[PDB]
Amino acid sequence: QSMLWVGVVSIFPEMFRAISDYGITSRAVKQGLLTLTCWNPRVYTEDRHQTVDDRPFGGGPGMVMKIKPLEGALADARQAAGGRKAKVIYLSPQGRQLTQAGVRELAEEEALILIAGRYEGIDERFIEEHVDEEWSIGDYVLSGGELPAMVLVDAVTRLLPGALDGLLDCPHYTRPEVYADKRVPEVLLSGNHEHIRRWRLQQALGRTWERRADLLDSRSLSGEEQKLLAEYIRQRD
Amino acid sequence: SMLWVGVVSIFPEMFRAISDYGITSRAVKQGLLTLTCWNPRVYTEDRHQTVDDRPFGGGPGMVMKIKPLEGALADARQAAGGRKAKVIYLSPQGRQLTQAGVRELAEEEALILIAGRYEGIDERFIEEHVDEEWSIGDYVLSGGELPAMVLVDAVTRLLPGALSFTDGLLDCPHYTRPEVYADKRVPEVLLSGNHEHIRRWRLQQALGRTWERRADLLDSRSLSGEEQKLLAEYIRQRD
Numbered sequence: 001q002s003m004l005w006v007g008v009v010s011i012f013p014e015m016f017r018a019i020s021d022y023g024i025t026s027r028a029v030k031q032g033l034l035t036l037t038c039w040n041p042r043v044y045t046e047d048r049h050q051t052v053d054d055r056p057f058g059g060g061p062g063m064v065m066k067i068k069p070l071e072g073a074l075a076d077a078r079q080a081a082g083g084r085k086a087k088v089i090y091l092s093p094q095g096r097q098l099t100q101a102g103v104r105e106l107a108e109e110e111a112l113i114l115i116a117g118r119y120e121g122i123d124e125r126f127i128e129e130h131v132d133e134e135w136s137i138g139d140y141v142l143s144g145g146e147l148p149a150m151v152l153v154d155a156v157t158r159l160l161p162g163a164l165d166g167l168l169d170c171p172h173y174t175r176p177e178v179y180a181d182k183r184v185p186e187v188l189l190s191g192n193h194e195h196i197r198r199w200r201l202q203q204a205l206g207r208t209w210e211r212r213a214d215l216l217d218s219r220s221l222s223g224e225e226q227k228l229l230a231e232y233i234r235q236r237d
Numbered sequence: 238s239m240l241w242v243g244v245v246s247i248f249p250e251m252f253r254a255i256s257d258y259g260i261t262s263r264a265v266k267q268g269l270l271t272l273t274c275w276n277p278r279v280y281t282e283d284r285h286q287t288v289d290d291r292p293f294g295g296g297p298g299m300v301m302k303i304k305p306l307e308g309a310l311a312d313a314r315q316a317a318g319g320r321k322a323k324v325i326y327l328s329p330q331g332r333q334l335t336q337a338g339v340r341e342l343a344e345e346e347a348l349i350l351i352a353g354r355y356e357g358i359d360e361r362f363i364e365e366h367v368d369e370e371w372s373i374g375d376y377v378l379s380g381g382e383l384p385a386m387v388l389v390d391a392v393t394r395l396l397p398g399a400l401s402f403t404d405g406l407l408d409c410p411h412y413t414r415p416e417v418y419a420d421k422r423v424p425e426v427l428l429s430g431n432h433e434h435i436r437r438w439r440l441q442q443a444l445g446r447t448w449e450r451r452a453d454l455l456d457s458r459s460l461s462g463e464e465q466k467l468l469a470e471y472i473r474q475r476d
C-alpha cells in the first residue's frame with residue numbers, strides 16, 4: 001500500500017538505521033509511505049567466511065565485488081517488489097550526478113532497488129545486465145555506496161506526498177536581538193511583511209549570485225528579481 | 238590519532254553508521270581517526286527551551302539558536318587540544334564538495350563539523366565561528382548528518398594506512414571471475430595482455446567513459462597527445 005518501495009543491496013544493512021530510525025524517512029516508514037527493506041549479499045555466499053570480494057581481472061590494486069552474491073540479493077530484492085515497476089540503481093562515482101531534477105524524476109517511481117557497491121566496485125557485465133541507471137552524489141570518492149544510497153532515499157522521500165527554484169536561501173536570525181556585538185537586521189525587527197518578503201528575496205538572489213552564479217545561468221531572472229539583485233550588488237562593499 | 242573529528246548534531250547516535258562500520262570504523266580502531274559528538278540540546282540555558290526557536294521577521298520554519306551551538310562548539314574546541322581545528326558548516330548554501338576539497342580537508346589535524354536540520358542557523362554564529370561551508374550536491378536533504386558522514390568517509394580513505402576524480406577522469410570498468418558471465422566475456426586485453434597493454438586500455442576506457450558521461454570534466458582538464466589518440470580511438474571504435 002506504500003507509495004514507494006525501496007530495496008537496498010548492501011553488505012552493511014545495519015548502517016541504514018540512520019534513515020530508518022531518524023527523520024522524514026523514518027516517519028514515512030511508520031506512516032507507510034515508504035517500505036524500507038535491505039538485502040545483504042553476504043547471506044547469498046557459498047562459503048563459511050562469507051567472502052564477497054573477488055580479485056580483479058588484469059591485476060591492479062583493489063578487489064571487485066563477487067558477482068554470484070550480488071546476483072542472489074538482487075533476485076531476492078526483485079522478488080519482494082512484486083508487480084511494482086522497479087528501477088535498479090547502482091550508486092557509482094561514474095554515474096549521472098544527482099541534482100534535484102533527478103530527485104523529482106526518481107520520486108515518480110513506484111519501486112527502487114539501490115545497489116551499494118564496495119571495494120573497487122561491481123563487474124561491468126553485471127551493470128550491463130541488471131542495472132537500469134547509475135547515480136553519483138558528487139565529484140568525490142567514498143569507501144562505499146551506503147551513505148550515497150541513504151542520501152538518495154532521504155532526497156526522494158521529502159517529495160513523497162504526506163511525508164512533510166534554483167535560488168539559495170536568505171540568512172536566518174533568532175533570539176537574542178543583539179548577541180556578541182552583532183545585531184539582527186532592522187528590516188526584520190521593525191518592517192512590513194512584504195518588505196521582509198522583499199529583503200529575504202533580495203538576500204536569496206544576492207547570496208546565489210555571490211556563491212552559486214552557475215545556478216543563475218540555469219535560472220531566467222524576472223524584472224522584479226533583476227532589480228532586487230542590481231540593488232544587492234550595488235548596495236554591497 | 239592522525240585526524241580528530243568532532244560533530245555538532247542533535248542526532249549524535251546517527252554517527253554509529255560510520256563509527257561501527259567500514260573504513261572509518263577500521264580507522265577509529267587502528268587509531269588513525271578520533272570521532273566525537275556534541276549534542277547542542279545538552280547546552281541550552283534551561284532544559285525547557287528547545288534548540289529550535291522562531292525566525293525574526295516571521296515566515297514559515299524554525300531557526301537554530303546561537304547559544305546552544307556556541308556551547309557545543311566551545312566544548313568541541315576544548316576537547317581538540319593543541320590541534321589546529323577547522324570549523325565546517327555542512328549546508329546546501331556552501332560551495333560544493335569535490336575530491337579536490339577532500340584532499341585539502343585530509344591535510345587538517347582536527348575538524349569540527351556542524352550538522353543542522355531542516356531549520357536554518359543564525360547567520361551571526363556562521364559569521365563568527367564557521368571557517369568553511371560545504372554542500373555535498375545540488376539536492377535537498379532533511380539535515381547535515383548524512384553530509385557530515387559523507388565528508389568523514391571521503392576524508393578517512395586518504396588517511397595513510399586506512400585502505401575517479403583523482404586525475405580529473407572517471408574510472409575504467411572492472412571485471413572479475415568468471416571469464417564469461419551472462420553471454421558477456423571479459424575483454425581479452427585483461428585475460429591475455431601485459432601490464433602495459435592493460436594500463437593503455439584502462440586509460441582509454443577512463444577517457445572514453447569521462448567523454449561519454451562527464452564531458453564537462455574534459456573541458457576543465459587538458460588532453461595530451463597520447464590521450465587524444467586513445468580518446469579518438471575510443472570514440473571511432475565505440476559503436
Ligand SMILES: C[S@@+](CC[C@H](N)C(=O)[O-])C[C@H]1O[C@@H](n2cnc3c(N)ncnc32)[C@H](O)[C@@H]1O
Pocket residue numbers: 090091092093094115116117118119120121122135136137138139140141142143144145146148401408409411
Ligand atoms: C572506492 S568507491 C569507487 C571506486 C571507483 N571510482 C569505481 O567505482 O570504479 C566504491 C563504491 O562506493 C560508492 N561510491 C563512492 N563514491 C560515490 C559517490 N560519489 N557517489 C555515489 N556512490 C559512490 C559506489 O557504490 C562504488 O562502487
Ligand SMILES: CCN(CC)Cc1ccc(CNC(=O)c2csc3nc[nH]c(=O)c23)cc1
Pocket residue numbers: 169298327328329352353354355356357371372373374375376377378379380381382384
Ligand atoms: C531553513 C532554510 N531551508 C529552506 C526552508 C533550507 C535548507 C536548510 C537545510 C537543509 C538541510 N540540508 C543540509 O543540512 C545539508 C547539509 S550539507 C548539504 N548538502 C546538500 N544538500 C543538503 O541539503 C545539505 C535543507 C534546506
